[PDB]
UniProtKB/Swiss-Prot annotation:
N-acetylmethionine modifications at: 8
Residues of the full protein shown: 1 to 283 of 435
PTMs per UniProt: Oxidized on Cys-217; the Cys-SOH formed in response to redox signaling reacts with the alpha-amido of the following residue to form a sulfenamide cross-link, triggering a conformational change that inhibits substrate binding and activity. The active site can be restored by reduction.
The protein, known as: Tyrosine-protein phosphatase non-receptor type 1
SUBUNIT field: Interacts with EPHA3 (phosphorylated); dephosphorylates EPHA3 and may regulate its trafficking and function. Interacts with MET. Interacts with NCK1.
Amino acid sequence: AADKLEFMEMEKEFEQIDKSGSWAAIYQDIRHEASDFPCRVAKLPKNKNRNRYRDVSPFDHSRIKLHQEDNDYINASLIKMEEAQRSYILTQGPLPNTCGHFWEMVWEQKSRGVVMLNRVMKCAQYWPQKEEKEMIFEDTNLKLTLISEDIKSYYTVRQLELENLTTQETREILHFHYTTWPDFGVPESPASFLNFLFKVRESGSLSPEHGPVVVHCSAGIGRSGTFCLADTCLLLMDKRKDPSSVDIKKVLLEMRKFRMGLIQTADQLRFSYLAVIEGAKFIMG
Ligand SMILES: O=C(c1ccccc1)[C@H](Cc1ccc(C(F)(F)P(=O)(O)O)c(Br)c1)c1ccccc1
Ligand SMILES: [Mg+2]
Ligand SMILES: [Mg+2]
Ligand SMILES: [Mg+2]
């Protein structure tokens, strides 16, 4: 019962920011205040073709390393949210030459789920679209088979089998693909986004029994940042005595310690607030 007033305060605050048209100002404060750490490995000449965008790089301190002697580099970051007790890997959409690296990362990190928030057409077609046309990544010795998929209006869930060809171990990977979230846009609705997030949660993919979920979009910052921020803030609102004590700006700044550029537009920041308030009300209702 105590939560009613807390949610009223959150909704009032949201409405005050809307009325004043202050989302961009708050978003620019976040950009201004965001961490700046070196990305020396990302910038090595040998890695140029491993980055989709020159201007989007993983920090050295939080990058995911491939277990390779040859070249350990992938444009991917580990976001470790200590208070929420959740970790995520945020990565760019695989390139034609980094699909093997992507799946190697999924394997090595022991991930159970991949969350994709963009569409191919960018991003390489890194998973099989037909059961009978499996993919083999010869560079990393991995085989990937589409087992089934469930296509809904705003998202698709695929069951994939990932096989390490060296050991013959197989793992089930769940692919959660939100298909209606344009570059620098927002999801179809808070409801659509939350339904999707709740499906990811329900699947167990986010549990500490597994490696970190792999989340990507095109650059691995805007949509991926929005998704992870909302999830973390929802965790915190459930965990804390007072849900209104969760400061979404503060949480985003924390996440930006681990990867640059998380949340790419003022409207995405707005959306994150809206989705978190609505999701928390739902959960705590
Ligand atoms: O490379 C980019 C850039 C470079 C200098 C200044 C500003 C931006 C971004 C890289 C970038 C950064 C973020 C996203 C994103 F936000 F949409 P995401 O949700 O992370 O895929 C995308 Br798509 C792309 C860009 C933006 C528009 C067109 C092409 C490239
Ligand atoms: Mg930039
Ligand atoms: Mg068929
Ligand atoms: Mg088999």
